[PDB]
Write a protein that binds this ligand. Sequence first.
Ligand code: HEM
Ligand SMILES: CC1(C)C[C@H]2C=C(C(=O)O)[C@@H]3COC(=O)[C@]4(CO4)[C@]23C1
Length: 397
Amino acid sequence: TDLPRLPFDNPDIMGIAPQMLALQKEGPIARVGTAGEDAWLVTRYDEVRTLLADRRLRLSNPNPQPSAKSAARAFMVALAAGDDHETEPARHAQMRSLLIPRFSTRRLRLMKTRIEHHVDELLDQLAASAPPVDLHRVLSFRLPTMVVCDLLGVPLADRERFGQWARGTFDQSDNEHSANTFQQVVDYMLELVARKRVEPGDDILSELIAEKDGALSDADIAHLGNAVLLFGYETTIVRIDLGTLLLLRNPVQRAQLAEDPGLAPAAVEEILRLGVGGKGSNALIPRYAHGDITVGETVIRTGDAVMLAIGAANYDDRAFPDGGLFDLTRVRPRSHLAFGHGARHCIGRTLARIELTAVFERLFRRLPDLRLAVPEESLRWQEHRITGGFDEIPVTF
Ligand code: HEM
Ligand SMILES: CC1(C)C[C@H]2C=C(C(=O)O)[C@@H]3COC(=O)[C@]4(CO4)[C@]23C1
């Protein structure tokens, strides 16, 4: 008997920690220690998907004496309207009602066109440069920040101002840096709301300002803008990095994709399913039980913390045959859980898929000899950031 303690070691730079796969083999749910509270860890696909759809399991903490959280986690939960368990039902319902129509098919069609031309220009700059080059800086970082500038209706150079703010806000190692960074986010977005009130355009804040004939306060609108800024580029950056790394590890699939860019949608779904970095602490969706829930033969009691391991579940052999293998020829693969599921299912997931599809349609056809310029083992997953990520991806081509 030895209580497993999150985060688990991973000897590889990607994939699932061996101890978590070991727990998955024993059963769907295990009690584990963490850096803070003990929690139930749920690792099998069927159970994680069922619990994500169970509205007794919520983001907000119902306990009278809530355990302490990093400033970074507190900001993340507040941006998702989860900071007050008594008001989360109404506030979270309103948040989704106001954000979902911002990602209309009309907007997504226009953005797909602009995204595809942008990737073309990004890859032309890449192809013309002298290697070694940092692919993270010149490609992975640049497309999703371009997209957030488009959503917010600001000049592209603004991403040079806000491009490290998700990382800084979500730095769990430094509460002062996290709070100082979030203040910069807030000031920028309040500036932006005041501008869009007199100079609207075809963008998110302008639509929120017009919503319900102006019923929302500037603070309410800026809060929604902050969620889009802070949730809306960094995780996509990380998936371009992971997808590149995964395709580099699978040359037969990569050659298939280069020969037939029509496989990119399928490749993107495999990248999202298998794209887990380092110790994979970001591939856990945290929840609290607001009522008792039975999982197998285990009772989760009201107030218990629950970690839903979407990464481990996406590797589950019971849901994906040969779950550890990258295979963009899978016939009718189950829907992966990388965007979550249920009440908090990722709001930008169709836009994120358009970005990743546009990149991987193009990348290895534009740069067929692309490869790392450094050993894989030298790439360092940033465990202190809630969103993880690599800081650089040196390549030659
Ligand atoms: C590949 C890139 C992305 C991944 C892997 C991802 C992943 C996720 C996941 C797993 C959740 C669920 C969190 C939970 O259940 O508590 C989520 C929620 C969310 N995502 Fe995404 N996301 C991505 C891109 C985006 C983009 C591009 C946007 C917007 C521009 C966005 C906006 C949001 C928002 C606002 C939420 C909060 C949903 C809620 O709490 O109701 N995400 N995302
Ligand atoms: C709102 C989020 C940014 C989306 C989710 C994906 C993430 C990621 O890929 O890094 C974030 C990591 O931390 C979490 O709690 C998550 C798993 O819910 C995320 C919160």
